[PDB]
Amino acid sequence: GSSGSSGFKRKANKELEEKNRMLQEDPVLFQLYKDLVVSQVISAEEFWANRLNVNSGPSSG
């Protein structure tokens, strides 16, 4: 939203862990990711790209 990003280097695919775990708990959402991705309509990256519009995680310290 607020024009201003830094995007630092990141090797760990923490995201994968989230999007992955989420799928399990959300067996219904998966169907969508497929009907779209498995349908060769869009790219997996795109799916989540929007999926995570607000869903954010809290900080530690």
Swiss-Prot record:
Residues 8-55 form the BSD domain. (Microbial infection) Upon Rift valley fever virus infection, interacts with NSs leading to ubiquitination by the NSs-FBXO3 E3 ligase and proteasome-dependent degradation. Coiled coil: none annotated. It is found in: Nucleus. Belongs to the TFB1 family. Component of the 7-subunit TFIIH core complex composed of XPB/ERCC3, XPD/ERCC2, GTF2H1, GTF2H2, GTF2H3, GTF2H4 and GTF2H5, which is active in NER. The core complex associates with the 3-subunit CDK-activating kinase (CAK) module composed of CCNH/cyclin H, CDK7 and MNAT1 to form the 10-subunit holoenzyme (holo-TFIIH) active in transcription. Interacts with PUF60. (Microbial infection) Interacts with Rift valley fever virus NSs (via OmegaXaV motif); the interaction leads to TFIIH complex proteasomal degradation. Component of the general transcription and DNA repair factor IIH (TFIIH) core complex, which is involved in general and transcription-coupled nucleotide excision repair (NER) of damaged DNA and, when complexed to CAK, in RNA transcription by RNA polymerase II. In NER, TFIIH acts by opening DNA around the lesion to allow the excision of the damaged oligonucleotide and its replacement by a new DNA fragment. In transcription, TFIIH has an essential role in transcription initiation. This is General transcription factor IIH subunit 1. It comes from Homo sapiens (Human). The lineage of its organism: Eukaryota, Metazoa, Chordata, Craniata, Vertebrata. The chain holds residues 103 to 150 of 548 of the full protein.
